[PDB]
Write a protein that binds this DNA or RNA. Structure first.
Lengths: 127, 206, 96, 79, 114, 59, 98
RNA sequence: AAGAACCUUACCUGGUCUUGACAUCCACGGAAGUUUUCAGAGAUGAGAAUGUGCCUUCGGGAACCGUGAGACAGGUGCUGC
RNA sequence: CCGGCCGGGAACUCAAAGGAGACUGCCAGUGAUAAACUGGAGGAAGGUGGGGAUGACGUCAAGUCAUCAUGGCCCUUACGACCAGGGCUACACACGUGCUACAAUGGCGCAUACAAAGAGAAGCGACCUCGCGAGAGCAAGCGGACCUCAUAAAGUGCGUCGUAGUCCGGAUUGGAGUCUGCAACUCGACUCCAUGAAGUCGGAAUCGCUAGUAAUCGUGGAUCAGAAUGCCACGGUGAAUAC
């Protein structure tokens, strides 16, 4: 199988054409170094991309669709799980144990009537 | 005061919509006002005719109005003359070519609009409210509804302080969206005031 | 009730949509200068009710100034009543 | 703050001001309509804006041209 | 670089001193900055006659510094002599730009008088 | 060429099409759209349809 | 090339009408692209439930316009002959295109 | 109140009422309408030009408009005890 | 044309119809051999998986005769009705609600990312030209998975500010374009250029929130000719703490 992006997290679905080769992220046919290479939090989203420990011999081209950056990273991570499941199913126990196979169903709660946010309530005066 | 309207909460689940048509946002309001005016005319003309539900379907060339009447013969008239006159006036209210069909309502007490307007007419005729409510619930339980609730409300029996009396027979499970409960209202314009009768009839879980 | 307000709304719709909105439109597009003014004086002479800004959208059944919803054509209480009776087609309670 | 396509005056006020300047023998000119820019023609005339039942007479000078007539009339009273 | 004011640059921007002078706004500041095209946080030593003449001609071409007291006191004074209420309402001290005076306007009114 | 001149507001009825025995009045034609706008009754349903002389054969 | 866009406030009527157009093209025996779902318009309205004074208590309503496109490859004259009143649905509005 | 420049819009000035802004009748006259002038802050008046089509078993009928008396209207007036 | 643009394909994202799945089903322990509770496998989801709608008999003669309808009472050449101007926007003050802050986890500049939900025909309006700009002129595509509103903002990568009353932005009549021209005076919004007030984190008290929650940062809608910091929705980053 060609290793491809699967999986979902927040509002995202993943498009990574990860492959045998040295790992350097390329985004929209442009380098990650040009996009956000020295960005702080680019590391805290790059570690989830590698969190599956299946990036070490794998070159990466990433243009995941939808959501913000961390949700995109979670989608990439979940895709590397489901694709490595398609490659060999023996590593299912270790990915399940480390928590990568789980889709986090956490999503933004809706705003409610009489409430400024989903749960935040307007200030109450006793009098 | 704090309760959901049963037809509205079951509007997508069990109970059907009263008006079925598609119009765009340009014509939606004009159509809705035309539905209201057509409904108002044939309601006021055929209130003696025991009209219960009025279904207006527009195929956007024309208008097709189906009247669910317990007494079809008075609406139809002799040789269809009365329903033809109704079709003509409904045509000039709608502004489009018109069609009226009569769908009969078997088991007239089982219909929620009909029992409410019957209790209203008795309250206009100064029959006892308790007599009207007990007759409503007893006939429904005889005809075989699983339940019926009748609420009379306001100025009962010509008393200055208003009161709300509910007579309940059987099962009326309003929280179940599976259940079919026909809920309808009628208004008695008595000399002391206005009395509201609200009835629920529960027939089955669909 | 509020019969004078309803008749005034009929008056301004009749003066704006039918008698004018071609005369007033031509005078307005003249009044924006395209390369004391006569278009200004004529637009003054035209009735004030010919302005579509004068029209206040009111509920068709009741006549309420506030609460109007233009897709429905009715004020908020009447769209609730017609919603529960099923008169508005496709209107179901939203529970997302 | 307003359109540069034209200065705005009421037509009836323009007719009465041109009649007053042309005649040259005039009393204060009563205008209920307050939203009128003073023209240079008005200077030398007395024009009465609408406040309450009372009379607010403004004798327009050279400076008060670009302003509307209602600026010189006070609509409310306070201490 | 002092023209028609009380302010001078002191190893800082000319623009803040010019708008510190009343009667002008920051458009003079922005345009003088655009014409200068250099860092103004540098020292004010070797303050140039070119900078001084540009500032002088720019204020002379636009609204001059110190016309603000003029504009306020003209509206006040001419309508107080005429007797019209327009000058009187700006004499009272409250905001007549349309702003709410029911509980706000502490900037115009001052600290609260109980 | 049959009916080579094209006249706005001309009424043609297609017996083969669903618009047979249907009568309508065209108040507005959208010249700015460049497509003729008629509320044609189709399948017994009157909705505005954009149309062209090349698009529909004239009767 | 014949383009039918069919919309309704109810999805069962939508599936019925698109099955009917598919049935007419299947009876004439032409290649039919399958019915493409097009995204639903959810028009939400928030309406105060009290006549005089309430702001927190308010109820929400949705009108949902379900949309389908058949995009049949081949039109024909026999379907043009049978076209008259083929939809027969007050619920669905159908727009034709060439 | 999910929209106070005017309008919305009740509270200060000028104009109106037995048909009132708004429905129904009885009578008489006029198609409905369009376009202007003057005065006026103005629905208000005082004037002019064109259109009696449409139809009635024409012993003239329309949606209408103008006017008159009465029935009648009208009220976001009071009492949510 | 290195734009899926274009043949093609429908493999994936996706749209939206129908299904499947979660039932303490299994396993252990406790408990009565019951209910249930505690853990464990499986599984994306585990014990109301999350959220919403749903508000029992009644209650407070709580709110609405000003949405409507309604009994009685009152006015009816006026308590009806029409227009102009005005008030609903005033101000010695005092609390309730939110907004902007009091900077350096921040400004300011230049370059670069990543959304979701919606609306749109008297409407949304690209492109181009003219404007510092709000905008104007010309004006394609669009009754919408197509076109437009609308090249999100926090995030940055570099610089610079290193007390600065700061871009934190208050303040009379200007210098303006747009809306309707009854018409922006009392009374609109917008880069407005007006003078750069107050505030160096707020006493006694008090409010909201247990996880995609608080906080923060943007976007859309309804109302609407114009006029939100309110209301209703949408996404992004994303805690801390429960003995």
């Amino acid at each position: 199988n060609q290793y491809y992006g699967t999986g979902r997290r927040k509002s995202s679905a993943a498009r990574v054409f990860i492959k045998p080769g040295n790992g350097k992220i390329v985004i929209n046919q442009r380098s990650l170094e040009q996009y956000f290479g020295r960005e702080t939090a680019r590391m805290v989203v790059r570690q989830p991309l590698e969190l599956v420990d299946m990036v070490e011999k794998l070159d990466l081209y990433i243009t995941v669709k939808g959501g913000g950056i961390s949700g995109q990273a979670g989608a990439i991570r979940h895709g590397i799980t489901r694709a490595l499941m398609e490659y060999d199913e023996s590593l299912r126990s270790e990915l399940r144990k480390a928590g990568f196979v789980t889709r986090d169903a956490r999503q933004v709660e809706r705003k409610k009537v009489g409430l400024r946010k989903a749960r935040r309530r307007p200030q109450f005066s006793k009098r | 005061g704090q309760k959901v309207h049963p037809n509205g909460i079951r509007l997508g689940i069990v109970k059907p919509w009263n008006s079925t048509w598609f119009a765009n946002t340009k014509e939606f309001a004009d159509n809705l006002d035309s539905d209201f005016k057509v409904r108002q005319y044939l309601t006021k003309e055929l209130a003696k005719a025991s009209v219960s539900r009025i279904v207006i379907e527009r195929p956007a060339k024309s208008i097709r109005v189906t009247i669910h009447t317990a007494r079809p013969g008075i609406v139809i008239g002799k040789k269809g003359e009365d329903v033809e006159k109704l079709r003509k006036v409904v045509a000039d209210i709608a502004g489009v070519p018109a069609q009226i069909n009569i769908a009969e309502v078997r088991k007239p007490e089982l219909d929620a609009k009909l029992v409410a307007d019957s209790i209203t007419s008795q309250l206009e005729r100064r029959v006892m409210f308790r007599r009207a409510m007990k007759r409503a619930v007893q006939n429904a339980m005889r005809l075989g509804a699983k339940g019926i609730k009748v609420e009379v409300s306001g100025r009962l029996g010509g008393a200055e302080i208003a009161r709300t009396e509910w007579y309940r027979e059987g099962r009326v499970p309003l929280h179940t969206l599976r259940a079919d409960i026909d809920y309808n209202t009628s208004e008695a314009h008595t000399t002391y005031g206005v009395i509201g009768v609200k009835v629920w009839i529960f027939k089955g879980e669909i | 009730a509020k019969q004078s307000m309803k008749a005034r709304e009929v008056k301004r719709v009749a003066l704006a949509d039918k008698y004018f909105a071609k005369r007033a439109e031509l005078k307005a597009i003249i009044s924006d200068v395209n390369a004391r003014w006569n278009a200004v004086l004529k637009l003054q002479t035209l009735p004030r009710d010919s302005s579509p800004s004068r029209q206040r959208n009111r509920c068709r059944q009741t006549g309420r100034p506030h609460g109007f919803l233009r897709k429905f054509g009715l004020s908020r209480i009447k769209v609730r009543e017609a919603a529960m009776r099923g008169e508005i087609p496709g209107l179901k309670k939203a529970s997302w | 703050r307003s359109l540069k396509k034209g200065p705005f005056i009421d037509l009836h006020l323009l007719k009465k001001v041109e009649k007053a300047v042309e005649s040259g023998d005039k009393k204060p000119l009563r205008t209920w309509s307050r939203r009128s820019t003073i023209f240079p023609n008005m200077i030398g005339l007395t024009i009465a804006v609408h406040n309450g039942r009372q009379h607010v007479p403004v004798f327009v000078t050279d400076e008060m041209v670009g302003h509307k007539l209602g600026e010189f009339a006070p609509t409310r009273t306070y201490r | 670089a002092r023209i028609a004011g009380i302010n001078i640059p002191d190893h800082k921007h000319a623009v803040i001193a010019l708008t510190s002078i009343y009667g002008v706004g920051k458009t003079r500041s922005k345009a003088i900055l655009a014409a200068a095209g250099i860092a103004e946080d540098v020292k004010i030593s070797e303050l140039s006659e070119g900078q001084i003449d540009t500032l002088r001609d720019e204020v002379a071409k636009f609204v001059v510094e110190g016309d603000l007291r003029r504009e306020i006191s003209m509206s006040i004074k001419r309508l107080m002599d005429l007797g019209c209420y327009r000058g009187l309402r700006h004499r009272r001290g409250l905001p007549v730009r349309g702003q709410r005076t029911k509980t706000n306007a502490r900037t115009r009114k001052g600290p609260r008088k109980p | 060429r049959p009916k080579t001149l094209f006249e706005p507001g001309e009424m043609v009825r297609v017996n083969d099409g669903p618009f047979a025995d249907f009568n309508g009045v065209v108040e507005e034609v959208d010249y700015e759209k460049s497509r003729l706008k008629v509320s044609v009754s189709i399948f017994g349903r009157a909705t505005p349809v954009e149309l062209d002389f090349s698009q529909v054969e004239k009767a | 090339r014949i383009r039918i866009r069919l919309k309704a406030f109810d999805h069962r009527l939508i599936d019925q009408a698109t099955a009917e157009i598919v049935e007419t093209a299947k009876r004439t025996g032409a290649q039919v692209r399958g019915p493409i779902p097009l995204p639903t318009r959810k028009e939400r309205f928030t309406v105060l439930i009290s006549p005089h004074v309430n702001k927190d208590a308010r109820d929400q309503y949705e009108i949902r316009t379900h949309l389908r496109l058949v995009d049949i490859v081949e039109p024909t004259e026999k379907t043009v002959d049978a076209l008259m009143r083929l939809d027969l649905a007050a619920g669905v509005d159908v727009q034709i295109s060439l």
